[PDB]
Amino acid sequence: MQRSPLEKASVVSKLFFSWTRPILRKGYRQRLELSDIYQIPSVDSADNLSEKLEREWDRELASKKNPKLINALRRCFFWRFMFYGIFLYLGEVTKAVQPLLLGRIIASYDPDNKEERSIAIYLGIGLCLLFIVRTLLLHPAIFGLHHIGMQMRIAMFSLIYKKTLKLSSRVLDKISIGQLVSLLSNNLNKFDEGLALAHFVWIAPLQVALLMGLIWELLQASAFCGLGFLIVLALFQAGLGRMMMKYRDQRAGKISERLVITSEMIENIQSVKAYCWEEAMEKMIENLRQTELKLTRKAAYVRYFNSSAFFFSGFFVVFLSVLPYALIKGIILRKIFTTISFCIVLRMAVTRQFPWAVQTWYDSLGAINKIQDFLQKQEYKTLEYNLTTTEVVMENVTAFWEEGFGELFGTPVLKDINFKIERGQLLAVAGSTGAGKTSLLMVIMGELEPSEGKIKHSGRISFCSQFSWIMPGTIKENIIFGVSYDEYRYRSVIKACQLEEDISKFAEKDNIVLGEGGITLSGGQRARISLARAVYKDADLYLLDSPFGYLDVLTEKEIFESCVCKLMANKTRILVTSKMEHLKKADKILILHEGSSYFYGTFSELQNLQTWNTYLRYITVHKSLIFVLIWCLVIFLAEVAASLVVLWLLGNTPLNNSYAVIITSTSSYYVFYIYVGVADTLLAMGFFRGLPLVHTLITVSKILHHKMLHSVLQAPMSTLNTLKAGGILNRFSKDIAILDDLLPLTIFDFIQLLLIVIGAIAVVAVLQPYIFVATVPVIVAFIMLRAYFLQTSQQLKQLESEGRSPIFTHLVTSLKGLWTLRAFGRQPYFETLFHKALNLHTANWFLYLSTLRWFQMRIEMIFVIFFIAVTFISILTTGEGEGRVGIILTLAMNIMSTLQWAVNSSIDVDSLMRSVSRVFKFIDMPTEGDIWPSGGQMTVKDLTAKYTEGGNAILENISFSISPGQRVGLLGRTGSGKSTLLSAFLRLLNTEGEIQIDGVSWDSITLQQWRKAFGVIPQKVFIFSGTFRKNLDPYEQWSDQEIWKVADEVGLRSVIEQFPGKLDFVLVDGGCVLSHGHKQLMCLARSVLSKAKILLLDQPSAHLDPVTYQIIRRTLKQAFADCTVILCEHRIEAMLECQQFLVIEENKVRQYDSIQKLLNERSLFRQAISPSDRVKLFP
Ligand SMILES: Nc1ncnc2c1ncn2[C@@H]1O[C@H](COP(=O)(O)OP(=O)(O)OP(=O)(O)O)[C@@H](O)[C@H]1O
Ligand SMILES: Nc1ncnc2c1ncn2[C@@H]1O[C@H](COP(=O)(O)OP(=O)(O)OP(=O)(O)O)[C@@H](O)[C@H]1O
Ligand SMILES: C[C@@H](COc1ccccc1)C(=O)n1nc(N)c2ccc(F)cc21
Ligand SMILES: [Mg+2]
Ligand SMILES: [Mg+2]
């Protein structure tokens, strides 16, 4: 990584941006490769800014009574803000006095002998130097302002992340991903680019005053009437501005809901596609989009009228400012022209520079105060005592989940529990489902505040949750988890959890690539990775929270009698089990039941007791756009014809008449100038030509989003597995926020500027031909630069924009699995691992900005050089009478200013349309594309499954047959592909082989009609945000009587009744309110509703107790009376019912008709069954 030459650069390079040149030199010819990007300047490393801002912030917190963040931000950046403000003030004043020189230079052309014929050269010199000072003084201030904005935003983001770790657990459920992702996404670009207009809040007044003086020297007593009209205009403008903000704070409440639905949708699309939930999800998403569109539509209309104020107030202001004086005394055309040339600047400085400045100030303060509110949130205070007697004590505790019951003190989820544990002794807390075992572990963690009672243990702790969590990276890094690696300890850990065979099964031996959460791995490997992590880290206390669920039985006995009982035989271990073998081995027992310590003691006591293609694809996608554009062009043609006839009539005029004092020496070259000064009004857009354009643009954005989603969802899984979660969150947030908010106005402004320039040039060329030849050497000079620039930026924006994802995809995981992350106490590690991604995105965005500002330098210097040459050639070549050529040049380069503005707008439009390019990238994704299920008799021949195209053999040469209504139980040691075969039944992943189902095959039936025959309860439960009734059946086919009768079969009464909204309670954060077993029962009910003839059960009993499990087998007898069942269990007890057994081994299936021959065939499997079940199998 080469160090940025910004640190090593001369002052001329910094004031001219000559050091950016190597990037464009490398980029214009060949595509950018990923070493050319410079390392960030040492100033804007996240650490320095974060430390500076946090020190100022916490000192300000300590000092003041009501701390405010904005005071610390001021104390940090105000000086380098004002040092730039003075330069911007000078560089905008230098636009007030330019028309002063310009008017007299224009006055010289007139043959009658004015004194100006001597001062013409001095005026030209002053004008030349004035332009060069403007160029050297304006842009560097803009770049520095953008740089300060960037630094501020970086420090704020790092502070946000530093807060989102110490955030108290009781608040997490309230705040979902939507708030945070919106608060970063909306800020990212707007708050950075918006610190160039922060000054124009106090620049606009002064400038206006300075203008209202000079115009007053021209116009004695009508400039005040013009100013009154302008003040009315500014009040109307601020009124529209206030109206618009009320139409955003009602959208920002639902953007988060749509974002969270989309994230939950795409993270586990596995179950979504398995269930054939395609249309209901689209209906819900578009239902949200409808309201969001109404709000965006109204906001867009309001924003449109705001924009037109410049373009359609120009004639009105001048008319009402020069009617009275002309009426009373008359006007020489010099007065009218200089009034126009001042009125342009006045219009600009009090129509699009004041209101946008106050807008950006309102919005920046709103975001800052929202962040300040965020930082005022309850902090989880830790009392982990390093001093202890190596003895863990817990006494008389009770806990409350929601804070209201906490303060008001519904039963608590615990009460009056107590235990005491030595060092070297193990507890085994076992509870029937819903008792609160995980809640007890959380209370031991202190993450739940005990409403009353006493806790004490060592400060050295480790954790292994019920639900696994896998941060993206290598298995080696994921297991070590930010510790100095060791050969011997790591090898011992891998020897205990017996990961050796599975780790040898992968292509890369030890370290592979795991995505967010790691769908790439199975369930057993994931749980055992988590357990290995909990074993590796060294501490005085261990909280293993039921890691023995997602495994077979032989692996269970091996791991439990080599790792828990043998490897770590001296260090305290809390164990959550549901097998009598553990309790027999257990040293003390605490059996919970419904939040009550139902039994405590010892097992002996227990026995005793009992790119231009996108430019077209965007437009042609909807016909309304083409119609609007065509009709607008026709209207413009009519308008330019009207202007043509007006100038034709006034050209052939045959001239007491003091209405307009006009003379032949002045007329022929002042009428054209004065018309071109008012071109932007006669060619403006009214409320009859503009509104359809904005409406159609918003409609097109909606259609684009809908198509993008419908193409993402039905995409094949092999493609989907490659892309991350950030690569969808980033898109669905930013690349639709842009297509809804910024584009439908920026493209409109571009259309307007292009249209105005074209019309003015056309009409003036028609009346004066040579001006065309006078302009062309500049326009062809313009595009030549633009086409050279775009190649750099056209390739760089992507290289930066995708760089956003390493932020979001790192924020989600840390937030998703915050609990273990804070459990081990590894905050600094993730702090640095986030700062790295932030510095990456900076190394992209900063250099992109430093290239755009350079192109502004170059474009305005092209204009200035042309302008200096024009003024020199023209004034010098003025003759004793009727100087002609100078008029021809100066009119052209009066047009050139607006044309340059149009070029800048065009660059901005392209930089935004990158977003539409990226969305069309997603839309081009491949497509996986009497009662039929009579008996369900199934036949599979020569099946094999592949995850990646041509990948390794996960299965090979499978074939079997299932008679109708004969449940076959499938089993096999973990990591052998049981879920693989279940998934490959649905041909989700790419397949090979042929299946006959009661006289039909795969080919003879369509895909969607094929998946209708099955019903699935996947290994990964799936609960989005919504109500119970909507969650259980989004299609809404069945009455609440149906739901209520099923909800007693599945034994869900005691879960619905305790919750306030029976079938109408809202669910948040993926059902985090519910437990695990309740989620399992919920999904099983969701499969009972969809009565399918052939059904696949993928581990219906994951962590359930021996008691509640009865319901499972219960709903297997009366409920599924005859339906064919593909049941994939691990607990051997659930295999007593099935008639055939399919054992999966060595990537092949072997079927047997019984159990005895199976078990004698594998001797090592025999000694693993518990005696209570071994007697059941062998009578
Ligand atoms: N995050 C939560 N928010 C609200 N209530 C909760 C939450 N977690 C648990 N509960 C309540 O606590 C009870 C069980 O707590 P907990 O989740 O610890 O049981 P569990 O051991 O996970 O259940 P299982 O044995 O099925 O795993 C449930 O009745 C549930 O209503
Ligand atoms: N999403 C995935 N991407 C790549 N490979 C996968 C993926 N899922 C599974 N595999 C491969 O399939 C094998 C295990 O398949 P599968 O997940 O069906 O086992 P399993 O029976 O589900 O395990 P368990 O007993 O934990 O349920 C592993 O070797 C793994 O490499
Ligand atoms: C599109 C117009 C609508 O008005 C008319 C349309 C046709 C004819 C007459 C009037 C507009 O929006 N205008 N016209 C202004 N003179 C103006 C000033 C400030 C502002 F915010 C908007 C403004
Ligand atoms: Mg649990
Ligand atoms: Mg499984």
PDB file of N, CA and C in Angstrom, residues 859-919:
ATOM      1  N   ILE A 859     -12.347  22.279 -15.208  1.00  0.00           N
ATOM      2  CA  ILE A 859     -13.427  22.781 -16.048  1.00  0.00           C
ATOM      3  C   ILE A 859     -13.511  24.300 -15.932  1.00  0.00           C
ATOM      4  N   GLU A 860     -13.399  24.820 -14.706  1.00  0.00           N
ATOM      5  CA  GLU A 860     -13.516  26.261 -14.558  1.00  0.00           C
ATOM      6  C   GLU A 860     -12.271  26.968 -15.072  1.00  0.00           C
ATOM      7  N   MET A 861     -11.110  26.306 -15.055  1.00  0.00           N
ATOM      8  CA  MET A 861      -9.933  26.932 -15.649  1.00  0.00           C
ATOM      9  C   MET A 861     -10.017  26.950 -17.168  1.00  0.00           C
ATOM     10  N   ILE A 862     -10.599  25.913 -17.773  1.00  0.00           N
ATOM     11  CA  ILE A 862     -10.868  25.965 -19.209  1.00  0.00           C
ATOM     12  C   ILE A 862     -11.742  27.169 -19.526  1.00  0.00           C
ATOM     13  N   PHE A 863     -12.822  27.334 -18.758  1.00  0.00           N
ATOM     14  CA  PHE A 863     -13.713  28.462 -19.007  1.00  0.00           C
ATOM     15  C   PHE A 863     -12.982  29.788 -18.820  1.00  0.00           C
ATOM     16  N   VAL A 864     -12.163  29.901 -17.773  1.00  0.00           N
ATOM     17  CA  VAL A 864     -11.490  31.166 -17.484  1.00  0.00           C
ATOM     18  C   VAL A 864     -10.472  31.503 -18.567  1.00  0.00           C
ATOM     19  N   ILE A 865      -9.720  30.510 -19.046  1.00  0.00           N
ATOM     20  CA  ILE A 865      -8.760  30.773 -20.114  1.00  0.00           C
ATOM     21  C   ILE A 865      -9.478  31.231 -21.374  1.00  0.00           C
ATOM     22  N   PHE A 866     -10.552  30.532 -21.753  1.00  0.00           N
ATOM     23  CA  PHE A 866     -11.322  30.967 -22.913  1.00  0.00           C
ATOM     24  C   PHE A 866     -11.841  32.384 -22.722  1.00  0.00           C
ATOM     25  N   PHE A 867     -12.289  32.704 -21.510  1.00  0.00           N
ATOM     26  CA  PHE A 867     -12.911  33.997 -21.260  1.00  0.00           C
ATOM     27  C   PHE A 867     -11.886  35.119 -21.318  1.00  0.00           C
ATOM     28  N   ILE A 868     -10.700  34.880 -20.766  1.00  0.00           N
ATOM     29  CA  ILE A 868      -9.638  35.876 -20.809  1.00  0.00           C
ATOM     30  C   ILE A 868      -9.208  36.120 -22.249  1.00  0.00           C
ATOM     31  N   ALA A 869      -9.051  35.041 -23.023  1.00  0.00           N
ATOM     32  CA  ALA A 869      -8.702  35.205 -24.430  1.00  0.00           C
ATOM     33  C   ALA A 869      -9.767  36.004 -25.169  1.00  0.00           C
ATOM     34  N   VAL A 870     -11.042  35.710 -24.899  1.00  0.00           N
ATOM     35  CA  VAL A 870     -12.134  36.399 -25.581  1.00  0.00           C
ATOM     36  C   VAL A 870     -12.135  37.884 -25.246  1.00  0.00           C
ATOM     37  N   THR A 871     -12.010  38.227 -23.963  1.00  0.00           N
ATOM     38  CA  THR A 871     -12.065  39.640 -23.603  1.00  0.00           C
ATOM     39  C   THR A 871     -10.864  40.400 -24.158  1.00  0.00           C
ATOM     40  N   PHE A 872      -9.696  39.757 -24.165  1.00  0.00           N
ATOM     41  CA  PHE A 872      -8.476  40.419 -24.698  1.00  0.00           C
ATOM     42  C   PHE A 872      -8.631  40.651 -26.202  1.00  0.00           C
ATOM     43  N   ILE A 873      -9.001  39.609 -26.952  1.00  0.00           N
ATOM     44  CA  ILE A 873      -9.076  39.747 -28.436  1.00  0.00           C
ATOM     45  C   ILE A 873     -10.126  40.800 -28.795  1.00  0.00           C
ATOM     46  N   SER A 874     -11.280  40.771 -28.122  1.00  0.00           N
ATOM     47  CA  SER A 874     -12.438  41.645 -28.455  1.00  0.00           C
ATOM     48  C   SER A 874     -12.138  43.114 -28.143  1.00  0.00           C
ATOM     49  N   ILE A 875     -11.804  43.429 -26.890  1.00  0.00           N
ATOM     50  CA  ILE A 875     -11.601  44.855 -26.493  1.00  0.00           C
ATOM     51  C   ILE A 875     -10.451  45.454 -27.310  1.00  0.00           C
ATOM     52  N   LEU A 876      -9.375  44.690 -27.521  1.00  0.00           N
ATOM     53  CA  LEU A 876      -8.201  45.199 -28.279  1.00  0.00           C
ATOM     54  C   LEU A 876      -8.636  45.532 -29.710  1.00  0.00           C
ATOM     55  N   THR A 877      -9.439  44.651 -30.314  1.00  0.00           N
ATOM     56  CA  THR A 877      -9.806  44.775 -31.749  1.00  0.00           C
ATOM     57  C   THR A 877     -10.961  45.767 -31.908  1.00  0.00           C
ATOM     58  N   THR A 878     -11.362  46.437 -30.824  1.00  0.00           N
ATOM     59  CA  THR A 878     -12.422  47.472 -30.945  1.00  0.00           C
ATOM     60  C   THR A 878     -11.899  48.589 -31.853  1.00  0.00           C
ATOM     61  N   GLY A 879     -12.727  49.062 -32.787  1.00  0.00           N
ATOM     62  CA  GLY A 879     -12.277  50.088 -33.747  1.00  0.00           C
ATOM     63  C   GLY A 879     -12.808  51.465 -33.398  1.00  0.00           C
ATOM     64  N   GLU A 880     -12.465  52.472 -34.207  1.00  0.00           N
ATOM     65  CA  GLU A 880     -12.967  53.818 -33.976  1.00  0.00           C
ATOM     66  C   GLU A 880     -14.488  53.857 -33.950  1.00  0.00           C
ATOM     67  N   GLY A 881     -15.144  52.853 -34.524  1.00  0.00           N
ATOM     68  CA  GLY A 881     -16.591  52.785 -34.500  1.00  0.00           C
ATOM     69  C   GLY A 881     -17.064  51.374 -34.749  1.00  0.00           C
ATOM     70  N   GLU A 882     -18.232  51.094 -34.162  1.00  0.00           N
ATOM     71  CA  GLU A 882     -19.040  49.872 -34.392  1.00  0.00           C
ATOM     72  C   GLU A 882     -18.171  48.635 -34.180  1.00  0.00           C
ATOM     73  N   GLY A 883     -17.577  48.493 -32.992  1.00  0.00           N
ATOM     74  CA  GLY A 883     -16.836  47.243 -32.749  1.00  0.00           C
ATOM     75  C   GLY A 883     -17.830  46.112 -32.890  1.00  0.00           C
ATOM     76  N   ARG A 884     -17.519  45.113 -33.714  1.00  0.00           N
ATOM     77  CA  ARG A 884     -18.525  44.057 -33.981  1.00  0.00           C
ATOM     78  C   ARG A 884     -18.079  42.757 -33.318  1.00  0.00           C
ATOM     79  N   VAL A 885     -16.875  42.288 -33.652  1.00  0.00           N
ATOM     80  CA  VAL A 885     -16.540  40.909 -33.308  1.00  0.00           C
ATOM     81  C   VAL A 885     -16.661  40.681 -31.806  1.00  0.00           C
ATOM     82  N   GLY A 886     -16.310  41.692 -31.009  1.00  0.00           N
ATOM     83  CA  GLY A 886     -16.367  41.543 -29.567  1.00  0.00           C
ATOM     84  C   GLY A 886     -17.747  41.190 -29.059  1.00  0.00           C
ATOM     85  N   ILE A 887     -18.787  41.750 -29.676  1.00  0.00           N
ATOM     86  CA  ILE A 887     -20.153  41.374 -29.327  1.00  0.00           C
ATOM     87  C   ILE A 887     -20.378  39.895 -29.603  1.00  0.00           C
ATOM     88  N   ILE A 888     -19.952  39.443 -30.787  1.00  0.00           N
ATOM     89  CA  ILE A 888     -20.137  38.063 -31.209  1.00  0.00           C
ATOM     90  C   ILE A 888     -19.490  37.105 -30.229  1.00  0.00           C
ATOM     91  N   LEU A 889     -18.330  37.466 -29.690  1.00  0.00           N
ATOM     92  CA  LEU A 889     -17.663  36.598 -28.729  1.00  0.00           C
ATOM     93  C   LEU A 889     -18.277  36.688 -27.332  1.00  0.00           C
ATOM     94  N   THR A 890     -18.589  37.902 -26.873  1.00  0.00           N
ATOM     95  CA  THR A 890     -19.021  38.069 -25.492  1.00  0.00           C
ATOM     96  C   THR A 890     -20.423  37.514 -25.265  1.00  0.00           C
ATOM     97  N   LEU A 891     -21.321  37.627 -26.247  1.00  0.00           N
ATOM     98  CA  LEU A 891     -22.620  36.971 -26.109  1.00  0.00           C
ATOM     99  C   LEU A 891     -22.457  35.461 -25.975  1.00  0.00           C
ATOM    100  N   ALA A 892     -21.607  34.880 -26.822  1.00  0.00           N
ATOM    101  CA  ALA A 892     -21.358  33.448 -26.756  1.00  0.00           C
ATOM    102  C   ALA A 892     -20.845  33.053 -25.384  1.00  0.00           C
ATOM    103  N   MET A 893     -19.924  33.833 -24.826  1.00  0.00           N
ATOM    104  CA  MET A 893     -19.398  33.380 -23.549  1.00  0.00           C
ATOM    105  C   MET A 893     -20.226  33.881 -22.372  1.00  0.00           C
ATOM    106  N   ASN A 894     -21.290  34.641 -22.632  1.00  0.00           N
ATOM    107  CA  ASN A 894     -22.345  34.777 -21.636  1.00  0.00           C
ATOM    108  C   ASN A 894     -23.205  33.523 -21.587  1.00  0.00           C
ATOM    109  N   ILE A 895     -23.444  32.905 -22.743  1.00  0.00           N
ATOM    110  CA  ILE A 895     -24.109  31.599 -22.746  1.00  0.00           C
ATOM    111  C   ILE A 895     -23.226  30.542 -22.083  1.00  0.00           C
ATOM    112  N   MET A 896     -21.910  30.655 -22.278  1.00  0.00           N
ATOM    113  CA  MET A 896     -20.996  29.614 -21.818  1.00  0.00           C
ATOM    114  C   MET A 896     -21.083  29.372 -20.315  1.00  0.00           C
ATOM    115  N   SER A 897     -21.425  30.390 -19.523  1.00  0.00           N
ATOM    116  CA  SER A 897     -21.509  30.195 -18.076  1.00  0.00           C
ATOM    117  C   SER A 897     -22.602  29.192 -17.716  1.00  0.00           C
ATOM    118  N   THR A 898     -23.811  29.413 -18.234  1.00  0.00           N
ATOM    119  CA  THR A 898     -24.898  28.477 -17.992  1.00  0.00           C
ATOM    120  C   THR A 898     -24.562  27.103 -18.555  1.00  0.00           C
ATOM    121  N   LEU A 899     -23.881  27.062 -19.702  1.00  0.00           N
ATOM    122  CA  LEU A 899     -23.502  25.760 -20.247  1.00  0.00           C
ATOM    123  C   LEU A 899     -22.539  25.020 -19.319  1.00  0.00           C
ATOM    124  N   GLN A 900     -21.594  25.740 -18.713  1.00  0.00           N
ATOM    125  CA  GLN A 900     -20.678  25.115 -17.763  1.00  0.00           C
ATOM    126  C   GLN A 900     -21.435  24.567 -16.559  1.00  0.00           C
ATOM    127  N   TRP A 901     -22.401  25.336 -16.057  1.00  0.00           N
ATOM    128  CA  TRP A 901     -23.246  24.823 -14.982  1.00  0.00           C
ATOM    129  C   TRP A 901     -23.946  23.534 -15.402  1.00  0.00           C
ATOM    130  N   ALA A 902     -24.415  23.480 -16.649  1.00  0.00           N
ATOM    131  CA  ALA A 902     -25.056  22.266 -17.144  1.00  0.00           C
ATOM    132  C   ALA A 902     -24.091  21.089 -17.178  1.00  0.00           C
ATOM    133  N   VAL A 903     -22.833  21.330 -17.549  1.00  0.00           N
ATOM    134  CA  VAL A 903     -21.850  20.246 -17.557  1.00  0.00           C
ATOM    135  C   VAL A 903     -21.638  19.698 -16.150  1.00  0.00           C
ATOM    136  N   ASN A 904     -21.524  20.586 -15.162  1.00  0.00           N
ATOM    137  CA  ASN A 904     -21.396  20.112 -13.784  1.00  0.00           C
ATOM    138  C   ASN A 904     -22.605  19.275 -13.372  1.00  0.00           C
ATOM    139  N   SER A 905     -23.808  19.744 -13.709  1.00  0.00           N
ATOM    140  CA  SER A 905     -25.007  18.979 -13.383  1.00  0.00           C
ATOM    141  C   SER A 905     -24.994  17.615 -14.062  1.00  0.00           C
ATOM    142  N   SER A 906     -24.478  17.546 -15.291  1.00  0.00           N
ATOM    143  CA  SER A 906     -24.401  16.268 -15.994  1.00  0.00           C
ATOM    144  C   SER A 906     -23.479  15.293 -15.279  1.00  0.00           C
ATOM    145  N   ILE A 907     -22.328  15.783 -14.819  1.00  0.00           N
ATOM    146  CA  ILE A 907     -21.424  14.916 -14.068  1.00  0.00           C
ATOM    147  C   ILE A 907     -22.119  14.379 -12.824  1.00  0.00           C
ATOM    148  N   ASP A 908     -22.847  15.245 -12.118  1.00  0.00           N
ATOM    149  CA  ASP A 908     -23.558  14.783 -10.928  1.00  0.00           C
ATOM    150  C   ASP A 908     -24.609  13.732 -11.279  1.00  0.00           C
ATOM    151  N   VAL A 909     -25.325  13.931 -12.388  1.00  0.00           N
ATOM    152  CA  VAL A 909     -26.346  12.967 -12.794  1.00  0.00           C
ATOM    153  C   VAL A 909     -25.728  11.603 -13.054  1.00  0.00           C
ATOM    154  N   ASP A 910     -24.594  11.563 -13.751  1.00  0.00           N
ATOM    155  CA  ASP A 910     -23.965  10.269 -14.023  1.00  0.00           C
ATOM    156  C   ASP A 910     -23.506   9.596 -12.731  1.00  0.00           C
ATOM    157  N   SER A 911     -22.858  10.370 -11.854  1.00  0.00           N
ATOM    158  CA  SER A 911     -22.419   9.822 -10.579  1.00  0.00           C
ATOM    159  C   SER A 911     -23.577   9.265  -9.767  1.00  0.00           C
ATOM    160  N   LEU A 912     -24.773   9.838  -9.898  1.00  0.00           N
ATOM    161  CA  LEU A 912     -25.937   9.243  -9.248  1.00  0.00           C
ATOM    162  C   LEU A 912     -26.473   8.023  -9.991  1.00  0.00           C
ATOM    163  N   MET A 913     -26.438   8.034 -11.325  1.00  0.00           N
ATOM    164  CA  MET A 913     -27.074   6.970 -12.097  1.00  0.00           C
ATOM    165  C   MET A 913     -26.298   5.664 -11.999  1.00  0.00           C
ATOM    166  N   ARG A 914     -25.070   5.731 -11.491  1.00  0.00           N
ATOM    167  CA  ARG A 914     -24.393   4.508 -11.056  1.00  0.00           C
ATOM    168  C   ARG A 914     -25.318   3.562 -10.284  1.00  0.00           C
ATOM    169  N   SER A 915     -26.223   4.135  -9.488  1.00  0.00           N
ATOM    170  CA  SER A 915     -27.156   3.329  -8.707  1.00  0.00           C
ATOM    171  C   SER A 915     -28.079   2.502  -9.597  1.00  0.00           C
ATOM    172  N   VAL A 916     -28.651   3.117 -10.632  1.00  0.00           N
ATOM    173  CA  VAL A 916     -29.515   2.372 -11.544  1.00  0.00           C
ATOM    174  C   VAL A 916     -28.716   1.300 -12.262  1.00  0.00           C
ATOM    175  N   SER A 917     -27.465   1.606 -12.600  1.00  0.00           N
ATOM    176  CA  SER A 917     -26.612   0.576 -13.191  1.00  0.00           C
ATOM    177  C   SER A 917     -26.516  -0.639 -12.275  1.00  0.00           C
ATOM    178  N   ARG A 918     -26.305  -0.388 -10.979  1.00  0.00           N
ATOM    179  CA  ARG A 918     -26.114  -1.504 -10.014  1.00  0.00           C
ATOM    180  C   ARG A 918     -27.421  -2.272  -9.789  1.00  0.00           C
ATOM    181  N   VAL A 919     -28.572  -1.596  -9.847  1.00  0.00           N
ATOM    182  CA  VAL A 919     -29.835  -2.305  -9.666  1.00  0.00           C
ATOM    183  C   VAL A 919     -30.138  -3.170 -10.880  1.00  0.00           C
TER     184      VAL A 919
END
